[PDB]
Design a protein around this ligand. Sequence first.
Ligand SMILES: N[C@@H](CCC(=O)N[C@@H](CSSC[C@H](NC(=O)CC[C@H](N)C(=O)O)C(=O)NCC(=O)O)C(=O)NCC(=O)O)C(=O)O
Length: 92
Amino acid sequence: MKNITIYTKNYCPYCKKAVSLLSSKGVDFKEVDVTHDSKAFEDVMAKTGWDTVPQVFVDEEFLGGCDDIHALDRQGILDKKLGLKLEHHHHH
Ligand SMILES: N[C@@H](CCC(=O)N[C@@H](CSSC[C@H](NC(=O)CC[C@H](N)C(=O)O)C(=O)NCC(=O)O)C(=O)NCC(=O)O)C(=O)O
């Protein structure tokens, strides 16, 4: 399955909204709370160049934060990035 991870901190309505969104999709994912783990969050920042939370990843891709995944969802793209169901229209 895809490796889906959302990095969060406490006191962050954007993080929890984003977590609830990912929970509503039924996907398997990890919420990683780095409120007090500055080294873990430094590794995350080195990759993305953002110092805010949440930061959401699917495999190697940084999808972005709360605004970005909500926008992707409104566009119908979020489901695709989370590796949800693939459809095929078979034509005779
Ligand atoms: N009370 C505020 C919002 C509620 C709230 O609790 N806000 C948070 C910050 S926004 S939540 C934390 C914030 N996230 C962001 O700003 C990410 C926004 C981006 N647009 C996205 O879509 O993800 C962030 O990372 N900031 C940078 C940093 O912390 O260094 C807070 O004040 N926490 C209190 C505390 O920390 O004690 C309001 O109504 O305006």
